[PDB]
Amino acid sequence: VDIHTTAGKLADLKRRTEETLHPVGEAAVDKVHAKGKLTARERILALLDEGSFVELDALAKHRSTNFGLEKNRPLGDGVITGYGTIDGRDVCIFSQDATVFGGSLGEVYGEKIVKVQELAIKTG
Amino acid sequence: TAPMQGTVVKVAVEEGQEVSAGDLVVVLEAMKMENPVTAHKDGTITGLAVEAGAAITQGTVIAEI
């Protein structure tokens, strides 16, 4: 679809969103299932009430250029962040993702955790 | 009246063209926007003072209603 059109921009959004589900390729998710572990997204969707999860800063990407890190900018920087409900009461949540750079904390990764912390404190 | 200086890209009302309140009267490309100018009041719109391709100036009478 022509990217210069509302329809094309909408489809592009949906494409990016899909990419956020497996930001370093499905092979890593497959290896984690072969390891028998839940990925950070499955963990959030397991802990929270089903469909309650609202995700913040999905499309984030790190800003580093040291040592060629600019060559690989995984969507989400390796943390999944947002809020939702447990037993119908709202909670703020984050889930760090081992398959992205080990899970090591970066700039954006920290900014996202900070955002969720601030929102949780503000909203009580 | 043309609310700003702009290219009249389309004129929308005819001669007597009885115009209802809130009808679009001109399309005026200004500020990179196809800004409509609309009739403030419902009545005859006989006269017109706009042509396509004209760089109509702010405050130029478009039509008398």
């Binding site: - | 700003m4 200086q5 200004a30 500020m31 702010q58």
Partner: protein, 135 residues
């Protein structure tokens, strides 16, 4: 403690993108928080274009230099593009224009030294914060 901003800048640094607008928003939000908390004084010493106008507007006092300081949102080139109006920066946003027409300046100094003197005179009357008695 009182805050003095001395302002001189062609607006946002276009190459850095939205970042500059986020940092502008943060500077504004700090000026709003400080509003009525501490004396804020803005010295305008040159072209304060674009977003650089709103910080002074949010500060408590504006000291401008008679002809070497100018302050405007939209450039004359843009004004011409949209309206055709021909004006200089000095007619648009010079210190005389902001003192006499729009009432945005609080002083128009004959020079930088006179501006500094004016700011020291203001600070001589203002307390350091709203929980302090005037000197």
């Amino acid at each position: 403690r009182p805050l003095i901003g001395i302002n001189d800048g062609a607006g946002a640094r276009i190459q850095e993108g939205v970042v500059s607008l986020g940092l502008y928003s943060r500077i504004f939000h700090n000026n709003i928080k400080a509003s009525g908390v501490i004396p804020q004084i803005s010295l305008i010493m040159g072209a304060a274009a674009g977003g650089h106008v709103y910080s002074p507007a949010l500060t408590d006092f504006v000291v401008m230099v008679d002809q070497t300081s100018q302050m405007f949102i939209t450039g004359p080139d843009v004004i011409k593009t949209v309206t055709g109006e021909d004006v200089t920066m000095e007619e648009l946003g010079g210190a005389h224009t902001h003192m006499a027409k729009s009432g945005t300046a609080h002083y128009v100094a004959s020079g930088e030294q006179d501006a500094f003197d004016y700011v020291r005179d203001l600070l001589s009357y203002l307390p350091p914060n709203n929980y302090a008695d005037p000197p």
